[PDB]
Design a protein around this ligand. Structure first.
Ligand code: HEM
Ligand code: HEM
Lengths: 181, 181
């Protein structure tokens, strides 16, 4: 199953440390996030929101970039990786109307998204889910986990990405900061 | 809503003319296809199969190709376009493991998918739905409609595509020929 749900509520594997509503409408503060490898039909009664997305095929990375990523990408659930961040992201209609070469050029040629990100592996385990096609309010769910010693580096990564040409097309973004229970 | 379901059975807006089980397991012959804008969990007991997929963003076409397509592409639902063909397609695992530059290279540089297809517009209207990400048995639902005068031209297009490098990665394919009721 390539579908995952993130339920904000009073149960889950992750305790919410804080929620930062970076751009556009935020997400209601909750105690925990519950991650499930499947679709959940309705938001539970005592829960505040449900996000969902699916794992999918590569859209932009070229073979040499994939080879570099797979060489350093860490697994999930490392013993030391007790911190995580869930960052749902929505991109603008102007982004989605662009052609494939236009979006690839902004993504890598102009913003160096992969090249910049590669600097912060193997410290940071990063994963991507897609959800525009499900009709969700966000387009992507991005997931990161790392040990506390890499907290400052991860903030530096965020600083760099938010200044990139690609981020001129981000129109909604929320950070859910988490600690493993 | 970008989700569409295709229910093969006794009712629908389209009459089945024939089903050509081109490659791999076919689809049961039915009287009609009912097309619904949205997901459907269950189908009538009278129905034999359900297909589903979603409309999505461009994955391969570059700006100059989009410009050429927009200049000649017809709209769906032309009064004259009383014939349609629903062609579900599944590509191999080897295809999906490839990186984005590798798949683009096969799609256009080697197979001339868009260049060949442009030769059959404006006669043929077309739409692409995606469903690998939904866990479906096919990867794509492709849709084509045209006036009867263009049936032989469409069959020629099929012949040219099935001979391309890209089609060496197609592992399941069915043609559901339809007439608008
Ligand atoms: C930590 C190191 C990172 C690496 C190695 C990395 C690498 C990548 C790669 C290779 C892709 C393209 C996947 C594809 O071709 O389908 C991608 C997509 C994406 N990443 Fe990153 N990334 C990193 C960090 C981040 C961060 C910090 C964020 C958000 C703050 C982020 C948000 C996204 C989004 C939204 C996409 C989807 C882009 C689109 O399809 O338009 N990534 N990432
Ligand atoms: C009739 C004229 C046609 C034109 C102008 C055309 C053009 C295109 C274009 C530009 C794309 C890329 C869409 C994107 O970038 O996301 C595409 C994708 C596709 N087309 Fe066609 N095409 C035609 C006919 C056909 C036929 C006859 C078939 C099957 C029998 C077909 C099957 C597909 C499939 C399966 C894809 C998705 C490829 C993938 O994502 O791997 N097309 N077409």
């Amino acid at each position: 199953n390539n579908r995952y749900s993130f339920i904000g509520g009073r149960t889950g594997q992750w305790q919410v440390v804080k929620i930062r509503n970076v751009l556009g409408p935020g997400l209601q503060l909750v105690e925990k996030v519950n991650i499930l490898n499947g679709a959940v039909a309705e938001i539970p009664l005592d829960s505040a929101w449900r996000l969902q997305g699916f794992a999918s095929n590569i859209r932009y990375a070229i073979r040499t970039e994939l080879e570099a990523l797979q060489a350093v990408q860490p697994m999930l659930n490392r013993a030391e990786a007790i911190l995580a961040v869930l960052i749902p992201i929505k991109k603008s209609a102007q982004w989605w109307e662009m052609a494939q070469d236009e979006r690839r050029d902004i993504f890598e040629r102009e913003s160096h998204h992969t090249a910049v990100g590669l600097e912060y592996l193997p410290g940071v385990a990063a994963r991507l889910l897609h959800c525009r096609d499900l009709g969700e309010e966000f387009d992507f769910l991005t997931w990161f986990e790392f040990a506390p010693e890499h907290s400052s580096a991860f903030n530096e990564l965020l600083l760099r990405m938010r200044a990139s040409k690609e981020w001129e097309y981000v129109e909604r973004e929320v950070e859910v900061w988490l600690k493993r229970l």
